[PDB]
Amino acid sequence: GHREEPYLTEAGRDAFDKFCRLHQGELQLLAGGVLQAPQPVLVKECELVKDVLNVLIGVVSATFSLPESISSLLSEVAEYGTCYTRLSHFSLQPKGLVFQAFTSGLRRYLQYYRACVLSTPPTLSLLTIGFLFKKLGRQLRYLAELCGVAFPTGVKLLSYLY
């Protein structure tokens, strides 16, 4: 025998890596050598999954600054932590007394968001993250429209929320 030998409908995880490498080489030739790509893997899958779980804690990785389809999944899950941080620094105080009660009530949700990640998962697949943190991460981004990040405060804010 000789084994029909992997087809396009067939094998992945090595032919898939081979395929994407070849297509990237095709783009590089088709420009003239003036298109430049970053590293095609970063750096693995499971290690990357744990890295993006750490992004949800509130620490963004040092690969961010203020396959190739990984970028499309990655931006959507990356921006969640950057707006979580944009809530936490506008919750840093120890004015409006009801406004301070409002700020601690915001902490009541931010702590829940920090608690749900990395107290649930042993390991999950990459796409599970993007599906799972859709009903919750968009809900986190809803609160940024609520906050200013003037800005009505005190009884004015309390009465609008009423």
Partner: protein, 316 residues
């Protein structure tokens, strides 16, 4: 090199693009028959311009066929002529004499046209009547079970040995069941009003079951029940809701005449109207358990006590 060689190893894509494939094998006549036949021709003096055959291996040709047969269209081998699959003439493995080949692939292509046309019927539904949708849903419930076996075979080409003579006998209980659809549908694709277009279609099926009153009859039966679903809903609805509501006389009854419900049709009309005069002052969920506990002959006359008692209730 470096990409083309590594492709050539792993990927198969070379017997139909540049550098047509050459297959070294065991030689000497027992599977070297194509080359012997070519040499025989060349000795016999055509004399010149050898027959263009591009040399594809066999197990592959099995894969391309199973893809065509499952119901996905648009493969490079087997060109269309008006939408009809026809055998391509560059195929040769290392034997099969290129003439028996051109007949056997034609036979299987004739069976592929039968499923092609049904998928065409469906593909123009994705780019109302509600009987056409139930028809398509029945066809699909059959189709997926058909496709699953073929899809399983495709893995096993890589695995044992697989050849044409095996896959033909293995697909014998399917190629039996395709031939009946080619005749049933051929009158269901040949025709304006939605009431004659429904009656003529129901009538084909109702005739086809009594025609042979065992794999074909299960086929006709399971396509039967999944297509009479709109009618039964309307039959119950006229009774219990005390009014008739149709698409545009999408129901074959009009306040166009199949005999399927003729031995009880009077009792239908005299109940459906009599409820309306009561208001002015689930039969499907019975029919589906009825199939669990003769077909469309004595069986249908056992449906009728349940609807007769209901008519008796209404008129009383």
């Amino acid at each position: 090199p470096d990409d083309r060689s590594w492709l050539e190893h792993h990927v198969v894509h070379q017997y139909w693009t540049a550098r047509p494939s050459q297959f070294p094998h065991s030689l000497h006549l027992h599977s070297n028959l194509a080359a012997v036949w070519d040499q025989h021709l060349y000795s016999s003096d055509p004399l010149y311009v050898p027959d263009d055959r591009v040399l594809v291996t066999e197990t592959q040709v099995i894969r391309e066929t199973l893809w065509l047969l499952s119901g996905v269209k648009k493969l490079f081998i087997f060109q269309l002529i008006d939408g009809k699959v026809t055998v391509r003439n560059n195929i040769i493995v290392t034997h099969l004499t290129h003439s028996c080949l051109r007949s056997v692939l034609e036979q299987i292509a004739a069976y592929g046209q039968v499923v092609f046309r049904l998928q065409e019927f469906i593909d123009e539904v994705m780019g109302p009547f509600r009987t056409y949708q139930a028809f398509m849903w029945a066809l699909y419930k059959y189709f997926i079970s058909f496709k699953e076996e073929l899809a399983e075979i495709e893995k096993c080409i890589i695995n044992t040995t697989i050849t044409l003579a095996i896959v033909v006998d293995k697909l014998a209980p399917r190629l039996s069941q395709l031939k009946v659809l080619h005749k049933v549908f051929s009158t269901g694709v040949a025709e304006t009003r939605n009431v004659v277009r429904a009656s003529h279609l129901l009538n084909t099926l109702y005739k086809a079951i009594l025609e042979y009153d065992e794999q074909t009859v299960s086929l006709l039966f399971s396509l039967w029940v999944e297509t009479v679903r709109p009618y039964l809903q309307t039959v119950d609805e006229w009774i219990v809701h005390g009014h008739l509501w149709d698409g545009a006389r999408e129901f074959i009854i009009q306040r166009t005449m199949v005999s399927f419900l003729k031995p009880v049709l009077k009792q239908i009309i005299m109940a459906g109207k009599s409820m309306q005069l009561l208001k002015n002052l689930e039969l499907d969920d019975v029919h589906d358990p009825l199939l669990a506990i003769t077909f469309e002959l004595t069986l249908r006359s056992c449906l009728y006590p349940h609807i007769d008692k209901q008519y008796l209730d209404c008129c009383g």
